[PDB]
Design an enzyme around this catalytic site. Sequence first.
Site: not given
Ligand code: HEM
Ligand SMILES: C[C@]12CCC(=O)C=C1CC[C@@H]1[C@@H]2CC[C@]2(C)C(=O)CC[C@@H]12
Ligand SMILES: C[C@]12CCC(=O)C=C1CC[C@@H]1[C@@H]2CC[C@]2(C)C(=O)CC[C@@H]12
Length: 403
Positions: A240, A243, A359
């Site tokens: 995450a 990507e 970024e």
């Molecule tokens: C372009 C930026 C990004 C977008 C659009 C994005 C979007 C999201 C969204 C929609 C969720 C909620 C998913 C849900 O409710 O199931 C989320 C969760 C999260 N994102 Fe981002 N994300 C971004 C970048 C990142 C980056 C750089 C990291 C850092 C390493 C990150 C770490 C996480 C983590 C760990 C969660 C889980 C939060 C939790 O469950 O407490 N994200 N993100």
């Molecule tokens: C929203 C997200 C963040 C940034 C990214 O690049 C792609 C995704 C899609 C999968 C999300 C992830 C956030 C962490 C999530 C909710 C989990 O713990 C399982 C599914 C996964």
């Molecule tokens: C969105 C994501 C980010 C980076 C990447 O390269 C490709 C993917 C698609 C699969 C995602 C993953 C985030 C972590 C997810 C949500 C899980 O925990 C299971 C499926 C997996």
Amino acid sequence: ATVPDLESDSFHVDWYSTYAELRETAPVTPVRFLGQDAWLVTGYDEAKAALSDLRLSSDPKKKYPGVEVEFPAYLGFPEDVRNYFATNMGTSDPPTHTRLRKLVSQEFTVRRVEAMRPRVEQITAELLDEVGDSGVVDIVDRFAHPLPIKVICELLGVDEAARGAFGRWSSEILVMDPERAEQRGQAAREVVNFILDLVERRRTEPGDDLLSALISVQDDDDGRLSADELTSIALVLLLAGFEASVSLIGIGTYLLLTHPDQLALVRADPSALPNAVEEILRYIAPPETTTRFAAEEVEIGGVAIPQYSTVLVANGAANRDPSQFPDPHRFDVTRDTRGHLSFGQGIHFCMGRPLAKLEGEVALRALFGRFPALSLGIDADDVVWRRSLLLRGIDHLPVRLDG
Ligand code: HEM
Ligand SMILES: C[C@]12CCC(=O)C=C1CC[C@@H]1[C@@H]2CC[C@]2(C)C(=O)CC[C@@H]12
Ligand SMILES: C[C@]12CCC(=O)C=C1CC[C@@H]1[C@@H]2CC[C@]2(C)C(=O)CC[C@@H]12
């Protein structure tokens, strides 16, 4: 009569038109996806409500009486692999979620992110020095993609002969094609093997990186992270961590190039860049869809979602709901973007927001500031959009540096 199939071209070709059609008819509706019945939520209010309702679990590891829980994201993943991807914040409900997020937030802070600004600027400058200053280049392969990866590897202490490998794995896991299922499950095992080796290597030789920090991290009332939680947390932070950032930079470059007016507005006032980033996320949210599981029967927007249903909250569709965002199909970098659902809503709100905004702002500012005559190498209608509801993006974007 006639339930929509999320695998059809209607959800991948001018897909936002299909969303408006559905939302108009019913903000909450039954659909088919990967051979299973589900409910899709396209309305804004309905989306916010669903994400706020804790009866809709985010934990796929949970067992229910005579129910086989299947989150689409795990197509083809062997169970041992699934649990490695699913034992972290985003895959847990309170009280587990609560402590996992608390232990991580102690290390993954704004301070640590801010201290990285000088390094991200430098990496951006280097990547740009390498593209040259003339001709056509795939801005994704030469910029949008390597930038986020280098930043996340440095943050986690991942190195040279490792980077680029997870790029292809990531590429395969991003899409759920029923016929490629095991190839999907295979890349998944590789990602896991890589992570397992990474963590053990860090345990043996700790550094200033975030992963070393999470290994020592401890709390008096919450404790520490188990080996499994540590491994799963590292996996999600790595994946995450880069990507969606790639999608933001690539889609954003594409957006500013096709809306000259907005691009001119940005070059003029640099202080308008931050909101430009927010509007890009609102306009085309990378995480178009978010998954929830109905642990109990839940009523969403006057519609009763049966117990044990799989719910696909379409964040992307909600961001273009006219009742919330007027003229939702107009990409406007000046509009109030407050309330969009691209970083989530509620307890699972994106922990990575600070890094993502950093970024996107640094990248786009550096890109356009360096190439005043940058133009799209191809016709806007020919841009290939990735076929994924899980994470939108552009895999190849030809641009002309000189014009
Ligand atoms: C372009 C930026 C990004 C977008 C659009 C994005 C979007 C999201 C969204 C929609 C969720 C909620 C998913 C849900 O409710 O199931 C989320 C969760 C999260 N994102 Fe981002 N994300 C971004 C970048 C990142 C980056 C750089 C990291 C850092 C390493 C990150 C770490 C996480 C983590 C760990 C969660 C889980 C939060 C939790 O469950 O407490 N994200 N993100
Ligand atoms: C929203 C997200 C963040 C940034 C990214 O690049 C792609 C995704 C899609 C999968 C999300 C992830 C956030 C962490 C999530 C909710 C989990 O713990 C399982 C599914 C996964
Ligand atoms: C969105 C994501 C980010 C980076 C990447 O390269 C490709 C993917 C698609 C699969 C995602 C993953 C985030 C972590 C997810 C949500 C899980 O925990 C299971 C499926 C997996």
